[PDB]
């Protein structure tokens, strides 16, 4: 299918994914065009921070869905 | 003196203590927790969370009172969020752990006549192909906070929360998306709006960007925000119902990307218009001028 990721600047990129893909696979695809390592990425969907290990099927991410990308600011 | 209890820092735990001071300063959130946990009088995250917030939402009962909130971290460490008990963490990531745990706890609860927690809102996403001008249908997704990108800053050019919000709501060009009319790809126009506003509005100002070189950059720029916030301009529908919000608390991050310290400005509890600077175990009176001059990271607004 095809999903959207709202990036750090607000610009929204398009990704080609499958419902069986893990989000570490998706974080890998965000790295391809944004250069963010997956361990530094936080992907949020429906108010939920997406846990590396699950697939897009467990979160029910369907076509034309918009994920939001934010970094981790420790304190 | 109208001072709240402080919270001990038992190992870089200011990310939790700052969030708890902010959350306890949101009276609608605490009233919802009391309503939600009232069914258990007919373990759980909500009971542990309410015990701390109820105590932090009132003036201290003893002079220089200090509480310990790591019982909360223990239960999250056991069941929701696998982290150490000593490493620095992001207060916004914790906010989403708490908010996800409460939605999961409510989905398993038996009193479904009760409302979702007040931070829960819904955003709209409209999309239209630029080639054929065929508007795709509306997509609503929920949100528990707004993560706003901080635009580029110029000397002498103010940087306002209203600007950050409008940029989050502005339309954009999205290239290489398949169309259902052109069958195709093509370039789409996408825009996010706000469908359902939450009674408690958490605003996350992204103080981490990505540099052109390939490393994170702390955003030190001051973002101007007001005690009063009108959200009418960002609604999807032409709703004639007004949406006025009032500032309850600010979570502030000092330091760089790796190292840092979280602090919180919050209103004093009525047993009003008096403000507090809370840094873990230390609570001081602060003027509204100091609050509005802080470098906000999380902003907690409550609808009036
Ligand atoms: Zn088209």
* DSSP structure string for chain B: -----EE--SSS-HHHHHHHHHHHT-HHHHHHHHHHHGGGG---HHHHHHHHHHHHTS--SSTT-EE--HHHHHHHHHHT----SSS---HHHHHHHHHHHHHHHHHT-S-TTSPPPTT-EEEEEEEEETTT--EEEEEEEEESSEEEE----BTTB--BHHHHHHHHHS-EEEEEE--SSS---EEEEEEEEEEE--SEEEEEEE-EEE-SSSSEEE-----B--SEEE-GGGBSS---S--EEEEEEEEEEES-SSS-EEEEEEEPP-----EEEEETTEEEEE-HHHHHHS-EEEEEEEE-
Question: What is the DSSP-derived secondary structure letter of residue A39?
Answer: G
d(CA B57, CA B89) in angstroms, rounded, equals: 24
At CA B282, angle to CA B256 and CA B94, rounded to 5?
A: 50
Question: What is the DSSP-derived secondary structure letter of residue A28?
Answer: H
8 Å CB contact of B141 and A45? yes
Of B163, B166, B254, B261, the catalytic one is B261
Minimum CA–CA partner of B148 in chain A: A10
Clarify whether B261 is annotated catalytic.
yes
d(CA B12, CA B90) in angstroms, rounded, equals: 11
Question: What is the DSSP-derived secondary structure letter of residue A63?
Answer: T
What is residue A60's three-state secondary structure? Answer: coil
d(CA B68, CA B66) in angstroms, rounded, equals: 7
Distance from CA of A64 to the nearest CA of B (A): 9
d(CA B194, CA B15) in angstroms, rounded, equals: 28
Q: Is B30 exposed, middle or buried (0-12, 13-18, 19+ CB in 10 A)?
A: buried
B153: closest CA among B221, B60, B230? B221
Q: In what order do the strands lie in the sheet with B186-196?
A: B135-143, B121-129, B186-196, B172-177
8 Å CB contact of A14 and B177? yes
d(CA B41, CA B248) in angstroms, rounded, equals: 30
Is the Cβ–Cβ distance between B265 and B276 less than 8 Å? yes
Distance from CA of B275 to the nearest CA of A (A): 23
Q: Name chain B contacts of A45, Cβ cutoff 8 Å.
A: 141
Is the Cβ–Cβ distance between B203 and B161 less than 8 Å? yes
CA distances from B279 to A62, B13, B160, B299 (A): 43, 11, 25, 16
What is residue A25's three-state secondary structure? Answer: helix
Helices B45-56 and B14-24, packing angle to 10 deg: 70
- Whether B244 is in a domain gets the answer yes
d(CA B100, CA B145) in angstroms, rounded, equals: 12
d(CA B196, CA B236) in angstroms, rounded, equals: 9
Distance from CA of B271 to the nearest CA of A (A): 31
CB atoms within 10 A of CB A15: 17
Clarify whether B14 is annotated catalytic.
yes
Report resolution (Å) to 1 decimal. Answer: 2.3
**3-state SS string for B133-172:** CCEEEEEEEEECCEEEECCCCECCECCEHHHHHHHHHCCE
Find the Cα–Cα–Cα–Cα dihedral B231, B237, B239, B242, rounded to 10°. Answer: 0
Is the Cβ–Cβ distance between B201 and B234 less than 8 Å? no
- Whether B13 is in a domain gets the answer yes
B3: closest CA among B58, B67, B78, B51? B58
- Whether B201 is in a domain gets the answer yes
Cβ-Cβ contacts under 8 Å for B213 (sequence gap 6 or more)? none
Minimum CA–CA partner of B151 in chain A: A9
Is the Cβ–Cβ distance between B58 and B4 less than 8 Å? yes
8 Å CB contact of B100 and A48? yes
Q: Is A53 on the interface with B (CB under 8 A)?
A: no
- Whether B241 is in a domain gets the answer yes
A44: closest CA among A29, A63, A65, A28? A65
- Whether B154 is in a domain gets the answer yes
Range of the domain at B267: 6-303
β-strand pairing of B121-129 with B135-143: antiparallel
- Print burial letters for B34-43: b (CB count within 10 Å at least 16), e (below 16): eebbeeeeee
Task: Report the residue from B127, B147, B174 with minimal CB separation from A68.
Answer: B147
Is the Cβ–Cβ distance between B147 and B128 less than 8 Å? no
Q: Is A49 on the interface with B (CB under 8 A)?
A: yes
CA distances from B221 to A32, B116, B253, B254 (A): 29, 35, 12, 12
CA distances from A19 to A29, A54, A55, B136, B245 (A): 14, 11, 7, 21, 39
8 Å CB contact of B206 and A40? no
Question: What is the DSSP-derived secondary structure letter of residue A10?
Answer: S
d(CA B79, CA B81) in angstroms, rounded, equals: 6
Number of domains in chain B: 1
8 Å CB contact of A12 and B190? yes
d(CA B27, CA B29) in angstroms, rounded, equals: 5
Tokens 């056991």 correspond to B78
d(CA B166, CA B43) in angstroms, rounded, equals: 42
Interface of B with A in 24-83 (CB under 8 A): none
Kindly state the tokens that stand for B245. Answer: 């919000």
8 Å CB contact of B149 and A2? no
Helices B45-56 and B27-37, packing angle to 10 deg: 140
- Whether B1 is in a domain gets the answer no
8 Å CB contact of A9 and B209? yes
Q: Is B270 on the interface with A (CB under 8 A)?
A: no
- Print burial letters for B69-108: b (CB count within 10 Å at least 16), e (below 16): bbebbebbeeeebeeeeeebbbbbbbbbbbbbbbbebbee
Cβ-Cβ contacts under 8 Å for B304 (sequence gap 6 or more)? B244, B245, B246
Kindly state the tokens that stand for B239. Answer: 């709703």
**Beta pairing partners, B230:** B244
Q: Is A20 on the interface with B (CB under 8 A)?
A: no
Is the Cβ–Cβ distance between B92 and B14 less than 8 Å? no
Kindly state the tokens that stand for B20. Answer: 């708890």
Residues comprising chain A, all counted: 75
- Print burial letters for B145-181: b (CB count within 10 Å at least 16), e (below 16): bbbbbbbeeeeeeebebbbbbeebbeeeebeebbbee
Q: Is B18 on the interface with A (CB under 8 A)?
A: yes
Tokens 């605003």 correspond to B203
What is residue A15's three-state secondary structure? Answer: strand
- Whether B250 is in a domain gets the answer yes
Q: Is A51 on the interface with B (CB under 8 A)?
A: no
Tokens 């015990």 correspond to B51
B206: closest CA among B260, B143, B243, B151? B151
Q: What is the largest CA-CA distance in chain B?
A: 70
Cβ-Cβ contacts under 8 Å for B91 (sequence gap 6 or more)? A75, B15, B16, B18, B19, B251, B253, B262, B297, B298
* H or E segment and range at residue A27: helix A23-34
Kindly state the tokens that stand for B113. Answer: 């006549």
B67: closest CA among B120, B17, B2, B112? B17
């Amino acid at each position: 299918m095809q999903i959207f990721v709202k990036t750090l600047t607000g610009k929204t990129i398009t990704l080609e994914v499958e419902p069986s893909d893990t989000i570490e696979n998706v974080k890998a695809k965000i790295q391809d065009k944004e250069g963010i390592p997956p361990d530094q990425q936080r992907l949020i969907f429906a108010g939920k921070q997406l846990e590396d290990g699950r697939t897009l099927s467990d979160y029910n991410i369907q076509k034309e869905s918009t994920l939001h990308l934010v970094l981790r600011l420790r304190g | 003196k109208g001072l709240v209890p402080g919270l001990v820092n038992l190992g870089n735990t200011c990310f939790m203590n700052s969030l708890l001071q902010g959350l306890s300063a949101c009276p609608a959130f605490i009233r919802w927790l009391e309503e939600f946990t009232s069914q258990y009088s007919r373990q759980y995250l909500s009971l542990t969370l309410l015990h701390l917030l109820k105590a932090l939402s009132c003036q201290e009962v003893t002079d220089d009172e200090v509480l310990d909130a790591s019982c909360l971290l223990d239960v999250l460490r056991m069941y929701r969020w696998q982290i150490s008990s000593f490493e620095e963490q992001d207060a916004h990531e914790l906010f989403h752990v708490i908010t996800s745990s409460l939605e999961d706890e409510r989905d398993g609860s038996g009193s479904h006549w009760k409302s979702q927690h007040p931070f829960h809102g819904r955003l709209t996403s409209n999309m239209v192909c630029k080639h054929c001008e065929h508007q795709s249908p509306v997509r609503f997704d929920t949100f528990d906070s707004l993560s706003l990108s901080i635009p580029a800053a110029t000397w002498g050019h103010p940087l306002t929360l209203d600007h950050c919000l409008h940029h989050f709501i502005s339309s954009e060009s999205v290239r290489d998306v398949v169309c259902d009319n052109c069958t195709k790809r093509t370039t789409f126009v996408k825009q996010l709006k706000l469908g359902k506003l939450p009674q408690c509005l958490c605003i996350h100002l992204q103080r981490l960007s990505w540099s052109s070189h390939g490393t994170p950059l702390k955003r030190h720029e001051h973002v101007q925000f007001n005690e009063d916030l009108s959200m009418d301009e960002y609604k999807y529908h032409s709703n004639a119902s007004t949406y006025l919000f009032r500032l309850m608390a600010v979570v502030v991050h000092h330091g760089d990307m790796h190292s840092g310290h979280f602090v919180t400005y919050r209103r004093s509890p009525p047993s009003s218009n008096q403000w507090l600077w809370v840094s873990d175990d230390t609570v001081r009176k602060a003027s509204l001028q100091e609050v509005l001059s802080s470098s906000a990271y999380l902003l907690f607004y409550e609808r009036v």
